[PDB]
Amino acid sequence: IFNRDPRDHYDLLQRLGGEVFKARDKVSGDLVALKMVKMEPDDDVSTLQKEILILKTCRHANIVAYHGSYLWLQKLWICMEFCGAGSLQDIYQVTGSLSELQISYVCREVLQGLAYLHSQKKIHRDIKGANILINDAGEVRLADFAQIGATLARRLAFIGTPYWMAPEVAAVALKGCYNELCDIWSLGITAIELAELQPPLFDVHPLRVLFLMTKSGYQPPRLKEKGKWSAAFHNFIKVTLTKSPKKRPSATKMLSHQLVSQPGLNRGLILDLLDKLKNP
Ligand SMILES: Cc1cccc(F)c1-c1cc2c(cnn2-c2ccc(N3CCN(C)CC3)cc2)cc1C#N
């Protein structure tokens, strides 16, 4: 983590949403994304060092490249590879729902990133449309993977108060005790999201959604229209949304599934999508 004004090395161009910036390298000419974070009272950047070193050693085509961080004037600027189409959520809010094939390509590319992340003993944890970014070439990039500020404040005010927590609580509070196969589940939900513009139960209260998942006789969600999709896509959803982690398949096992291993899946499918965005 570097320790100077990133304006020295980069030129700001425009705000995007939520304060992420379009920017260009003054020397290299490469476009970048700068994710900025305010840091007021008693934030410590040195507690994000194990999570930055996870993000730095991630070197894969389907992961957003990390380029370095900048602490300056009580602000943390995280620099990254720019994806000019935004997230799949940004796109589908204009385009409407994705075709099965477009979803199939997305799922394979996401699976490829997850396979890589899992082989390194890393877990993504927040797989959804908003974190699947798309470049102008129609390639698929997973975004950064929480432990800071008002977010880390709120999250623990739930589990307990940190100074009074036991080690077993602490362990759960930081990491969740759960495994890589959680991302496989999250992908299955994302495939429904892309298909239907919302995940299952988006009109239901989040806590009740969580509660029901723990109850006996729980049924994992499904695609709403049966006839719109192939049996292969219905199977992809069945299998990713396996209730038990013990029986849910791995990312590499999922790359053998008909839906993602079928021929003719490539970035052209998303080039159609980005054309549709421009002409909606
Ligand atoms: C996902 C995310 C959540 C929260 C904070 C964040 F910084 C990011 C985030 C956003 C990112 C990138 C890399 N590129 N972009 C990016 C670029 C342009 C656009 N726009 C939207 C409006 N359109 C009209 C044009 C296209 C959207 C997103 C990396 C992260 C990370 N990590």
UniProtKB/Swiss-Prot annotation:
Active site at 126
Domain (Protein kinase) ranges: 10-260
MF terms (GO), sorted A to Z? ATP binding; MAP kinase kinase kinase kinase activity; protein serine kinase activity; protein serine/threonine kinase activity
On the tree of life, the source organism's domain of life is Eukaryota
The tissues in which it is expressed are: Expressed primarily in hematopoietic organs, including bone marrow, spleen and thymus. Also expressed at very low levels in lung, kidney, mammary glands and small intestine.
Phosphothreonine: residues carrying this PTM? 151, 161
Instruction: Please list the residues that bind ATP.
Output: 35
Q: Which GO terms describe its biological process?
A: cell population proliferation; cellular response to phorbol 13-acetate 12-myristate; intracellular signal transduction; JNK cascade; peptidyl-serine phosphorylation; positive regulation of MAPK cascade; protein autophosphorylation; protein phosphorylation
**GO cellular-component terms in the record?**
cytoplasm; membrane
Q: Which residues form a coiled coil?
A: none
Protein keywords: ATP-binding, Kinase, Nucleotide-binding, Phosphoprotein, Serine/threonine-protein kinase, Transferase, Ubl conjugation
Q: Which residues carry this modification: Phosphoserine?
A: 157
Regarding how it is modified after translation, the entry says: Autophosphorylates: phosphorylation promotes ubiquitination by the Cul7-RING(FBXW8) ubiquitin-protein ligase complex, leading to its degradation by the proteasome.
Assembly information from the UniProt record: Interacts with MAP3K1. Interacts with FBXW8. Interacts with CLNK (via its SH2 domain).
The UniProt function text for this chain reads: Serine/threonine-protein kinase, which plays a role in the response to environmental stress. Appears to act upstream of the JUN N-terminal pathway. Activator of the Hippo signaling pathway which plays a pivotal role in organ size control and tumor suppression by restricting proliferation and promoting apoptosis. MAP4Ks act in parallel to and are partially redundant with STK3/MST2 and STK4/MST2 in the phosphorylation and activation of LATS1/2, and establish MAP4Ks as components of the expanded Hippo pathway. May play a role in hematopoietic lineage decisions and growth regulation.
Sequence similarity:
Belongs to the protein kinase superfamily. STE Ser/Thr protein kinase family. STE20 subfamily.
Full protein name: Mitogen-activated protein kinase kinase kinase kinase 1
Q: Which organism is it from?
A: Homo sapiens (Human)
Q: Which residues of the full protein are shown?
A: 8 to 294 of 833
